[PDB]
C-alpha cells in the first residue's frame, strides 16, 4: 500500500552497478597481503579498523534504493562467505562485482539473461571440479602454520600459535579466540565442553559487538526429559535468582512456551537466561548428559530410575560453570568445576569401557567422549595496546582459524588466485548449449581473473600483466605479491583452502547470476 | 570560453534518441493518405496548419540540449530532402528514426560504429542502385497526373491542373505557384521569364512566410558590363527615388561593393533593390539579355558598339516588368510589358535565324530562346475561404510541382513504400567485409520496411502484417492504404518519383548513420 | 582588483587534475582506427560530428576555474600541436594527461618539481633524438598513400586522392581543400598562385566557421613601394565601391595608419577589404611582383621607371582574380584570369632566362617562379550529402594533408604508437644527475606507452597486454588494431610522419612538466 517507483531496463541496470560499484571498491582495497584497512565510523564509541571483506561489506547502505539494492546483494554473497567458510568474503565480493559487471554488459533485445545465468551455473560447476581435481590435503604440521600464516595477513606469530594448538589439541579440537589484556598474544588449554547445538531463540543475545550470548559464572539447568510443570520451572527460576547466578538450560526442545516465558523474562531488566538443544538423539545423549553432571557437579532431573523431580529442584542438586558462550550453531561452557575425583573416575569407567567389544560406530562417540573429557579446549588470547588493535587482530585470527579448519577439512590449493587462474583451461573444454550460455562461459572465464588482478594492484603493480605472466609460467609458479617476485607458491607456503575458493566462487556467481536476469526494478519512494 | 556540460555514452546516446524520436513522431502523423494535420503556433498571427514533413521538423525546437541535438540533426535531414527534390521529407524523417535507433541499438565495447557507418552506405548505395535498375520514365500525360494526385494527398483536381499545365507549356515549362481570392483554383498562362540565377546576398528578403524577394511593377536596370562609376549607379538609384518604383539590376557579378551599397540603402526603411547575375557566360548571354531588353522596352548600357553609358541613365532606357520573384536558385519576372510589335519582330528573326545551319549545340539554345518567347510561364492559383487552407493547399501544391518535375526528371517506381521494399532482396546478395559491416547492413534492410509501416499505421492497421503480405506478393502487388486494400499499384496510379525515393534514403542515412557514430556530446550550459 | 581564491598543494593539484582528466577522456574517446566521434553543440547551427583531438579539446571550458586552468592548459597542448604539425593532437593530449598525472603523483615534501621538470626535458630530448635515429624517409607515391590513408581513419580513396594530386603537381605543391557540392570527392588542377604571408591584423576575418579571409572575384591593388598618399588610395577605395568588387592589395608593409583605416571601413557593413606583404626582400620580389601583374591583367603602381601614381587608378591598370583565400600563413589567390597570351610570352621569357648562367641560387627562383606558372594549384572537393558529413570528412583530408605533406618534410616512423615505445630502451641508458631527475625520466618512460594503450583500449582490447607483447617483439612488429592482430608495420602501411610524433611529445611536455612545478592556484572569485 505504499507508493513504488518502477525502473525498466539499462537506467536500472546501471544504477543498481553504481552501488556494487561503491560496495565492491571499498572492500577491494583490503584484498591481499599490501591491501589496507578500512576505519568504519560506530555510533556508541570509538571507530573500529579492519582488513575484513564481510565486515566492510556490511557497514555500507547506500541513500539510493536502486544502488542499495545491488549494494545489499553484494552484501548478501560477502556474508554467504562468512557463513559458509569465514574467509574469502573480499574474493567473492571482487567477483561477484566482476560477475554484475561482464552480465549487464552482455544484454541486449535478443539475448536471453536467464540461459546467460544457466551457462554461468555450468561454467562455475566445472571450476568447482577442476579446483577439487587440483586440490591437496594438509599433512604436515607446518603446512598448518603456512595456511594460518596467509590467512593472517602474513602474521608469522598468529600462525605459529595457531599450529601450536593445533598440535596440542589436534586438528580437530576446539580453538576460541577472545581479548588478552597482556600487550602479547597466549595461548592456554583449559578444560572446555562443546556441542553443535545452540540458543533455539535469538532473543537473549546481551552483547552487540560481539553478536553472541556470553555468561559468566551460570547456574546449569539439566532436564532430561520435557520439563515437568511450571511449578517445576518456577522454583529453578527462584532458586537461580536467589543464588546470583544465571540460568543455562540443557534439554530436548524448549521452543513454544517455555521458551516464551524466559524471552518476556529476559525483557524484564537484568534477569538472565538461555537455553540449548540436546547434543545427541540416542544413547549418546544420555552418555553426554552424565559427563556434563559429573564435569559440573550436583544431580539430574528426569531420569527413569532415580526419578528426581525439577519440582523439588536444589542449589547442591544443579552444576556450576565458569563462562558460558552461546552461538548460533554450538553451545561453549567453559571452567566448569565438578568433582575432579568423580571426573577421574568418569575417565576410569570411558577408558575402562573402550576395552570391552567393537563395533566401529559406537567406539567413535565413545572416544569423542574421551577427547572430550581429555583434550582440553584450546583459548587464544589476542593482546594489545588499545581495543581497536585488539579488534583487528581479532579479525585475522579468527580468519586464520577458520581457514586452517577448512583446510584440514577439505585441502589446500595455490594462493594468490593462482587456483581460479589455472582452473580456466577446463573453460575451454566445454562446449555451450547455445549462444547465450557461451556467453555465461565467457563472463565465468573473465571473471577467473579477478583475485589475482585485485591482489597484484594493491601492491602497486600492473595487474593484468602479471596475471598474463602467471598463465604463461608453469603451473607451480604463481606471483607473490609480498616480496613482488614469481615464485614456486606451495614451497614458498602462499596457499589457499580448497573450500574458500569453492565456496567463494559459488556465491558470487548465484547471486551475481541472478541480479543480471533483473529488467524491471520497484523500489519504495523515500517517505 | 562558455562552460559546456560533457556526457559519455549510452546515456548521451538516449538523450539525442529521445529528441529524434519527439521529432520524428509529429512527423511521421502526417504520412500518407490517411495522415493528419499539425498545427503550429505562430507568433505573428494566426496558426498554421500542415500536412507537410520539413515543416513540422523545422518547427520543433527543444529546451533540452542533448534531445535538442538530435531534433536538429533530422531537422537537417528533413531539409536537405526539401532542398534536393521537394518531397519526401517524411519518408527522409522516418528512415532517419529509424537508422539512428538500430545504429543506437547495436553499440557496444567491440563494436566498431565506423564501420557499421561503412557498411550502412555500402548497403544503401546498393539499394539506390537496385532503384535506378527497377525505375521506369514517364511517357503518358495520365502518368503526370497521377504523380501529382498521389503526391498531393490523393487531389484529383490538383494533379489534373498540374497535368494541364504541363501539357500547355510543356514538361520542362516553368510553373509557378500562388493564391488567389476566389475559392476555386485556377490555371492560366500570359507570358513569364525565369533563368536559373538567384540573389547574391541573402539580405534584400521583405516576406518572411514566403522567405523570398518578391516585387510588385520593378524598375529594370541593364549592365551588360561591369558598372562603370559610383556617378552612374548613384543618378539610377535617384531616377528609381523620382519614379516611384524600385530596382531589380541584371549584371555580370555584384559581390563586393557596389552589393555593399546596396545592403546598406536596404538597411533604410522603404528603400527596395535587388541583384541578379547573369545566365549564361558566352553569346547566349548578349542574344538573351537582348531578349529581356526587348521584352522590357527601353536601352542597354554597357555594350561595344553604341556605347551607352550608365551615367546618362534615363526614365525611358529602362525596362518596366509587373512582377519579380527572386528565390535562391533562379529568378522570375512576370508580366513584363514591352513593345509587343518589337516582340513579335524578335521572334521573327528568332525563327528566321532558326532556318540558316546546325551544330546541334547553338540551335538548342536558339529553341530555349525560343520557347522563351513562345511558351508562357504557367501560373497555378490555388483558392480557399481563408489563408490557413489555401496554404496548406497551396503546401500540396508545391509538393505535386516537385514530385511531378523530378518525375520527368528521373523516372517512376512503386509507390506507398513498395519500392524499398522490392529493393530488399539487393541487400541479402551483398557478403560484408567483417562483422561491423553486416550490422549496418542489416540495419538499412531493417529500416527499407518503415516507409509502407507507417503509411499502414497512419491509416489504422497494423504495419508488419501489411508488410509481410506485401513481400509475401508479387513485385507488382502493393497495399493501396486509402482503399485499405491489395492492388496492382503502377494500375492504380500510386507511384512515386524515384529521386524522392533515393534522395530521402541517401540523406537519412548520411545523417543517422553519422550520429550513430558519436561517443561523447558536449553542450552549453543553460544560462 | 577583483577578489581572487588562493588555493595550495594536493587539493588545488587534484582540481586541475580533474579538468585535465574530464578533457583528455573526451579527447581520447577519438584515437585511432576504433575511435569514435564527439558530437559538439553549435550556437548557431547544426551541431558538429567531429573526430579530431583539437577541435574536442577547444570546445571544452569548465565551470570551475581550478579544473578549467589544467583544461585549458590541455587546451594549449593540443593548439600548439595542431599549430607546428596539423596532426597529433589526441596523441599530445593523452601523453600531456599521462604526464601530469605522473608528476602530480610524484610531489612530496622533499621532492623538487622543477628539477622533476628538468628531467623530463632530458628525456623528452634523449627521445627524439632516438626518433630522428630511427626515422626514414619517404621515396615512394605509395608511401604517401599509405601515410594519407592512415592518417585519414583508414580512408583508401582519401588517400588515394591526396597520393594523384602530389604526383600531378610535385609533393611540395599547394593543394587545398574546400566542399563539393556532388557526393563523391574529386580532385582539379587548374591554376593557382600562393606566397608565404598573409594579412598584418586579424581584423578583417568574415568566414566565422573556417576562421579566415575567403573573398569571390576581388580587385588586385599593386604598390610595389610605399603607398604614397591618402589621395592615392582613396581614389582606389572609390573606384572598387564603383566597381562592385572588393579589395586585396599587396604591398611592402601596411601596418600603422593605412591598416588602421582600412580596418574603420571594414568596421563599416559591407566594405570588404584586406592587405597582404610581400612575398620577397630582393630582386625575387619585383619578379614575383611582375608575374603576379602578367597572370592577373593591369598594370602597376610604385616603380622607378614608368612613373605610374596610384593617385591616378584606373579599372583597366588593377588586376581581377576568382577566388581570395587569406591565412594566418600563406595567401591564396585562385582563378585570376590574366591575359594568357602574355602569361604565355612570360612563361617563354622565365624559361630563355634560365638558359643564360648558372649561380645555384638564383635558379632555384627562377625555377619555383616556372612551377608557380607551369604546376598549378590542385584543388581536392570533399563530398557528401550534407554539412555534417563533409565537415567530418574535410577534417580528415586536413590530417592526411598535413601529415603527407610533414612526412615528406621530415619522414616516417612506425605507427600506432610503436615509434615511442621502440624509443624506451633510449632512455634506460641515460643516468640522471639526481634523484628528481630520475623522477622525470620514470615519468617520461611510463608515458612513452600510452598512445599504443589508448589505441588498443579504443579496440576493445586490454592496451596493456598489447603494449608488452608489442615490446616483446620484433622491432618492426606491432598492433594492427584494425585488424586486431600483430603485423610489420611498414609492409602493412600503418606508418606515421616523424615530425607528428615529435612535435606532439614535446608540446606535451612542456606544458605538462611545467604543470606538475605547482603549489598555488589563485583564481578570481566567481561574479
Ligand atoms: N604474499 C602473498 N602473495 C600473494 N598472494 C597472497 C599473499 N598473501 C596472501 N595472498 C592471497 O590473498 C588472498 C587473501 O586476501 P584477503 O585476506 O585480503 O581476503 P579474503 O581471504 O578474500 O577475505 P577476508 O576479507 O575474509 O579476509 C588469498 O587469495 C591469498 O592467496
Ligand atoms: N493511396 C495510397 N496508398 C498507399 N500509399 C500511398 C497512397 N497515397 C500516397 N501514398 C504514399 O504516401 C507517401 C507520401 O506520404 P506524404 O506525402 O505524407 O509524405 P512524403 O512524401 O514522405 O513527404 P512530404 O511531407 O514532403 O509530403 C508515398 O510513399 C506514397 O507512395
Ligand atoms: N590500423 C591501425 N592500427 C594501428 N594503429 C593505427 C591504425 N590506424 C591508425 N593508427 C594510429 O592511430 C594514431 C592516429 O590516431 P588519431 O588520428 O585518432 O589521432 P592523432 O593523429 O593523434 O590526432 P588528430 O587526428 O585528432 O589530430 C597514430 O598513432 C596511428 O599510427
Ligand atoms: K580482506
Ligand atoms: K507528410
Ligand atoms: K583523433
Ligand atoms: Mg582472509
Ligand atoms: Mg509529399
Ligand atoms: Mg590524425
Not at 51 to 56: A, E, P
Not at 89 to 118: M, Q, Y
Request: charged share 30%; proline share 3%; hydrophobic share 40%.
Amino acid at each position: 500500500g505504499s507508493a513504488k517507483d518502477v525502473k525498466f531496463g539499462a537506467d536500472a541496470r546501471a544504477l543498481m552497478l553504481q552501488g556494487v560499484d561503491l560496495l565492491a571498491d571499498a572492500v577491494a582495497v583490503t584484498m591481499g597481503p599490501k591491501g589496507r584497512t578500512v576505519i568504519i565510523e560506530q555510533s556508541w564509541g570509538s571507530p573500529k579498523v579492519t582488513k575484513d571483506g564481510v565486515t566492510v561489506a556490511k557497514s555500507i547502505d547506500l541513500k539510493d534504493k536502486y544502488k542499495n539494492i545491488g549494494a545489499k546483494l553484494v552484501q548478501d554473497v560477502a556474508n554467504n562467505t562468512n557463513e559458509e567458510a569465514g574467509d574469502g568474503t573480499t574474493t567473492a565480493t571482487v567477483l561477484a562485482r566482476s560477475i554484475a559487471k561482464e552480465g549487464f554488459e552482455k544484454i541486449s533485445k535478443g539475448a536471453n539473461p536467464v540461459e546467460i545465468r544457466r551457462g554461468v551455473m555450468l561454467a562455475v560447476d566445472a571450476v568447482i571440479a577442476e579446483l577439487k581435481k587440483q586440490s591437496k590435503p594438509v599433512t604436515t604440521p607446518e603446512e598448518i602454520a603456512q595456511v594460518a600464516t596467509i590467512s593472517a595477513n602474513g602474521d608469522k606469530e598468529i600462525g605459529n600459535i595457531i599450529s601450536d594448538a593445533m598440535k596440542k589439541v589436534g586438528r580437530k579440537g576446539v580453538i576460541t579466540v577472545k581479548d588478552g589484556k597482556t600487550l602479547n598474544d597466549e595461548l592456554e588449554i583449559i578444560e572446555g565442553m562443546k556441542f553443535d547445538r545452540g540458543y533455539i531463540s535469538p532473543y537473549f543475545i546481551n552483547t552487540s559487538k560481539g553478536q553472541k550470548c556470553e555468561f559468566q559464572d551460570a547456574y546449569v539447568l539439566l532436564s532430561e526429559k520435557k520439563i515437568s510443570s511450571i511449578q517445576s520451572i518456577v522454583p529453578a527460576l527462584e532458586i537461580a535468582n536467589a543464588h546470583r547466578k544465571p540460568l543455562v538450560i540443557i534439554a530436548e526442545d524448549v521452543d513454544g512456551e517455555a521458551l516464551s516465558t524466559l524471552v518476556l523474562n529476559r525483557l524484564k531488566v537484568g534477569l538472565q537466561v538461555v537455553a540449548v538443544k540436546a547434543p545427541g538423539f540416542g544413547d549418546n545423549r544420555k552418555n553426554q548428559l552424565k559427563d556434563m553432571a559429573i564435569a559440573t557437579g550436583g544431580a539430574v532431573f528426569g531420569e527413569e530410575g532415580l526419578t528426581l523431580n525439577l519440582e523439588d529442584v536444589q542449589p547442591h542438586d544443579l552444576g556450576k560453570v565458569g563462562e558460558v558462550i552461546v552461538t548460533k550453531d554450538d553451545a561453549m561452557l567453559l571452567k566448569g568445576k565438578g568433582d575432579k575425583a568423580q571426573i577421574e573416575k568418569r575417565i576410569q569407567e570411558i577408558i575402562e569401557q573402550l576395552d570391552v567389544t567393537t563395533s566401529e560406530y559406537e567406539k567413535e562417540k565413545l572416544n569423542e567422549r574421551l577427547a572430550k573429557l581429555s583434550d582440553g579446549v584450546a583459548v587464544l588470547k589476542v593482546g594489545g595496546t588499545s581495543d581497536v588493535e585488539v579488534n583487528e587482530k581479532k579479525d585475522r585470527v579468527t580468519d586464520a582459524l577458520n581457514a586452517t579448519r577448512a583446510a584440514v577439512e577439505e585441502g589446500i590449493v595455490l594462493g594468490g588466485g593462482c587456483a581460479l587462474l589455472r582452473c580456466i583451461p577446463a573453460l575451454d573444454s566445454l562446449t555451450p548449449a547455445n549462444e547465450d550460455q557461451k556467453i555465461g562461459i565467457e563472463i565465468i572465464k573473465r571473471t577467473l581473473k579477478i583475485p589475482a588482478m585485485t591482489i597484484a594492484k594493491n601492491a602497486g603493480v600492473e595487474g593484468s600483466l602479471i596475471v598474463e605472466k602467471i598463465m604463461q609460467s608453469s603451473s607451480e609458479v604463481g606471483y607473490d605479491a609480498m616480496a613482488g617476485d614469481f615464485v614456486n607458491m606451495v614451497e614458498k607456503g602462499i596457499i589457499d583452502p580448497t573450500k574458500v575458493v569453492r565456496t567463494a566462487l559459488l556465491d558470487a556467481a548465484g547471486v551475481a547470476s541472478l541480479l543480471t536476469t533483473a529488467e524491471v526494478v520497484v523500489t519504495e519512494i523515500p517517505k
